Design a protein around this nucleic acid. Structure first.
Lengths: 51, 102, 118, 122, 193, 112
RNA sequence: GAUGGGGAAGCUCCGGGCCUGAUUUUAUGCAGGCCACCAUCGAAAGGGAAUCCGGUUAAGAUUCCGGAACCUGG
RNA sequence: GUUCUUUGUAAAGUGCCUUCGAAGAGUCGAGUUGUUUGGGAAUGCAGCUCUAAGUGGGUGGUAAAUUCCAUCUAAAGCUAA
RNA sequence: GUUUGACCUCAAAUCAGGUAGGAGUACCGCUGAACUUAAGCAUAUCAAUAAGCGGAGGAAAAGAAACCAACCGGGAUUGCCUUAGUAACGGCGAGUGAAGCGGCAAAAGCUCAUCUGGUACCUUCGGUGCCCGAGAGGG
């Protein structure tokens, strides 16, 4: 303890951080189409990880 | 027309009720096995404890009489002059003393 | 390599021995971690570990189906047969049973179907 | 005509004051199902880090990556069987990975350094 | 007719006495017993048979109790909020019958079954009593018999909510013919012409 | 209180409400006339042995097409009512203990 | 607030289980005996079984460790 | 198109003879209170109360004698397109 | 006076077998608004709309006359067509608003008032072998 301890919750917030990461060089390179700005990007001060 | 008026607010709702759980109880008078030609209900008052539910005192009486069903105890209503170590008898052939029920 | 056909030809003892080798070999690919590589064997070992489990499950179903054809059985085979509640609802079955008997018989009669019939 | 004394006498012998009996139960017949053996590979990879090595040297302690339906008993049994070492205490940790860090404390009867060498980890 | 006609006859009556004693005593049993009462027997054999009641597996007879009166509508104390035509608590009545509400309640509890059937059988004052036939679709007994076979098909499920039952047809005003009737083919069927 | 030491009817509430009312159902009522009367066991018992022998007497009998009886016994309220109207029945039995009452009700009048 | 019963179509809403004895020490197995107002959840700051000393890490620590102690269950 | 094979019994047509039930009650119908409808004394449905007959009965856009006309048997059910 | 074995009614358990609850877009059964319209408004209108709730299927729902009728004939039920802005309602203001028929799509008339479960046997929508519980008339 603390915080916020609930095991289930903790995992979701942790899981989400990794999911918000930068792209791998390669997908730009084998390439589909996209000036590939991920988008999902989540942010230091700003936005909110989600309510 | 109105907003609801205070009387109508009594109605029900948490703001209206008493805090029923701070109340010790009732203290309704029991219901005789039978007889009671002296002391098949024998109580001794061991204590006098306030009821917040009527702003008056209760007397803790115990009550020891038998069987299976037996029924006994609890907080019957205190009268003036009733005290710890004084006897209570509750029923038909009880003596006519203050605190005795008949 | 491993092909599906080779696993079927193998025995219940033999495939179990395969699953044991496969886990060891996958385990060595764990150790060979420091690099990158090592995987064109793990992706395919993942497929192999799946094939060997499938092939055994399939062998046990078939064997079960043979043993039980003789007797009475079937909650498990029942699930494949319907493929649930709606297709089940479409049954009992209702169809031949419904006109299994009254008043049709009278109605008619056929020397007549033949006689005409060419 | 006037009524019976398991029914009269028993009642003389109560005032309820419960019953009592109990009554039976087989398995019936049409057969149910499930045979399964479904099996997780508890040990997933050895973790490999700089902190892990010092814990190998310093206090004889393996670092494994484990499943998230692992426990401490499962890990103790798993190391014992596959590595023939007997395991004395097991530490289990959530990671922000979404995976489990286990620091597994081993007996001095087989030191952590050459157990480790055959399924290497740094 | 043969046995039944007497029983049926007694039913016509009911201030009236041989039925009337039975029923007056049965009122006592009725008040004690629950909203759900499953019963082995039709207190009705005459009405039940025409009812297609046949003794055979999957068949049940069940007694249901529904309140008598008008309608009361929510939300009292916070009365609406609309012009006087809208307004009604007690003024309004159910369009659906008390019989029909009894069928939906019975079928709700006995999810497994579908109602064939509703017959009315005691009035006391506060309560209305309906004895409902519910029929098992699912089993082979009901199925093997052609006379019953219809109940089983998947379209019929929840017939009482759907209003397909004899009472349901009746409360649509359906019977059966012409002018009286025209918009009974369905309510929504005129489709704001 | 000991002062020996009970019966279930005497003070004790439940097991059941409903049977108790059922017992009440029979004894009380108001009432407009139903049914009562006669059966000491002796008069029953002779009739009861003569009904078992009414079935048991059976031959009736292994050859034919036409082929004379001995016995016919038919049970059930519907069969009984029909056979009275047919005037074939020599003697019927009705049970006192019938509930709902209205099943048996037709026969006492009808048979007379 | 699970939870009779009852309104409301309905959403919605209030108001036997426990302990054994032949066998036998494996627990199988036949057979008997008790008793009142019943569930879970609800405070990481109510209440509560037991641990400290210092040593070490780049980032943990009354958790790991070196010493020493103690508890809980069965 | 080809091929297997049970007896039968009872059903059915045509024609003679009488005859007749499986035919559904708090229903049909009424008032007083509703709401719905194009439905108007005359739509349909709810509720309370009351309440038939048994080949008698219901319908035929107010209600009442008759013969009869003209039509149909509720209070039960299923059902392809 | 007193019990014991058995008959049936109610209850509780139990495991088996069998089915349901929920869901998919709209289509498809009830309870039930308002602004809006009448240049106000209260009947009427919006509207039996929307909503809410219940619930089914691949279509659903309705069906072989206690029908139609205003004659003399038709002959089950939907839908389409048009009957017709007719009848009828209605501050008889504003508005509201059919049916029978005619003929089309497509057609169909029937049906009520030994059964099942268990185990065995097979070529397992079946039946055999057993055991168990429960429109009508005459010649």
């Amino acid at each position: 303890m603390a915080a916020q301890k609930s095991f289930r919750i903790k995992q979701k917030m942790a899981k989400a951080k990794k999911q918000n990461r930068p792209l791998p060089q390669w997908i730009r390179l084998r390439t589909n189409n996209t000036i590939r700005y991920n988008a999902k990007r989540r942010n230091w001060r700003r936005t909110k990880m989600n309510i | 027309m109105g907003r609801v008026i205070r009387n109508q607010r009594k109605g029900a709702g948490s703001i209206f009720t008493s805090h029923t759980r701070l109340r010790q109880g009732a203290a309704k008078l029991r219901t005789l096995d039978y007889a009671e030609r002296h002391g098949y209900i024998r109580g001794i008052v061991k204590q006098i404890v306030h009821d917040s539910g009527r702003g008056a005192p209760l007397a803790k009486v115990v009550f020891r009489d038998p069987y299976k069903y037996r029924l006994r105890e609890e907080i019957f209503i205190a009268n003036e002059g009733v005290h710890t170590g004084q006897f209570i008898y509750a029923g038909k052939k009880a003596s006519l003393n203050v605190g005795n029920v008949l | 390599g491993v092909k599906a056909y080779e696993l079927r030809t193998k025995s219940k003892e033999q495939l179990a021995s395969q699953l044991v080798d496969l886990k060891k070999e996958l385990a060595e690919l764990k150790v060979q971690k420091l690099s990158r590589p090592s995987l064109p064997k793990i992706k395919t070992v993942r497929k192999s570990i799946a094939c060997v489990l499938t092939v055994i499950n399939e062998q046990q179903r078939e064997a079960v189906r043979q043993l039980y054809k003789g007797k009475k059985y079937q909650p498990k085979d029942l699930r494949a047969k319907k493929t649930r509640a709606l297709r089940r609802a479409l049954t009992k079955f209702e169809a031949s049973q419904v006109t299994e008997k009254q008043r049709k018989k009278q109605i008619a009669f056929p020397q007549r179907k033949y006689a005409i019939k060419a | 005509k006037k009524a019976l004394k398991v029914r009269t006498s028993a009642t003389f012998r109560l005032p309820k004051t419960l019953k009592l009996a109990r009554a039976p139960k087989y398995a019936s017949k049409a057969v149910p199902h499930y045979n399964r053996l479904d099996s997780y590979k508890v040990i997933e990879q050895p973790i490999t880090s700089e902190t892990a090595m010092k814990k190998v040297e310093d206090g004889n302690i393996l670092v494994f990556q484990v499943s998230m339906k692992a426990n401490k008993y499962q890990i103790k049994k798993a190391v014992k069987e596959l590595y023939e070492v007997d395991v004395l205490k097991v530490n289990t940790l959530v990671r922000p990975n979404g995976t489990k860090k286990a620091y597994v404390r081993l007996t001095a009867d087989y030191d952590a350094l050459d157990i480790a060498n055959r399924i290497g980890y740094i | 007719m043969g046995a039944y006609k007497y029983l049926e006859e007694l039913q016509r009556k009911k201030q009236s006495d041989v039925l009337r004693f039975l029923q007056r005593v049965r009122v006592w049993e009725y008040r004690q017993k629950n909203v759900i009462h499953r019963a082995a027997r039709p207190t009705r054999p005459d009405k039940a048979r025409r009812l297609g009641y046949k003794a055979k597996q999957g068949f049940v007879i069940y007694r249901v109790r529904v309140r008598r009166g008008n309608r009361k509508r929510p939300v009292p104390k916070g009365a609406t909020y609309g012009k006087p035509t809208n307004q009604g608590v007690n003024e309004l009545k159910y369009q659906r019958s008390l019989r029909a509400t009894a069928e939906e309640r019975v079928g709700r509890r006995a999810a497994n079954l579908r109602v064939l059937n509703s017959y009315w059988v005691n009035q006391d004052s506060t309560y209305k009593y309906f004895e409902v036939i519910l029929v098992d679709p699912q089993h082979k007994a009901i199925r093997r018999d052609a006379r019953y076979n219809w109940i089983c098909d998947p379209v019929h499920k929840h017939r009482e909510a759907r209003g397909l039952t004899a009472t349901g047809k009746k409360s649509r005003g359906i019977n059966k013919g012409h002018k009286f009737n025209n918009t009974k083919a369905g309510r929504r069927k005129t489709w704001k012409r | 209180r000991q002062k020996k030491i009970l019966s279930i009817r005497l003070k004790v509430p439940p097991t059941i409400a409903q049977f108790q009312y059922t017992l009440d159902r029979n004894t009380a009522a108001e009432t407009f006339k139903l049914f009562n009367k006669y059966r000491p066991e002796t008069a029953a018992e002779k009739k009861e042995r003569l009904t078992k022998e009414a079935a048991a007497v059976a031959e009736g009998k292994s050859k034919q097409d036409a082929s004379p009886k001995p016995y016919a016994v038919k049970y059930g309220l519907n069969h009984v009512v029909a056979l009275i109207e047919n005037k074939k029945a020599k003697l019927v039995l009705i049970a006192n203990d019938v509930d709902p009452i209205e099943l048996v009700v037709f026969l006492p009048a009808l048979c007379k």
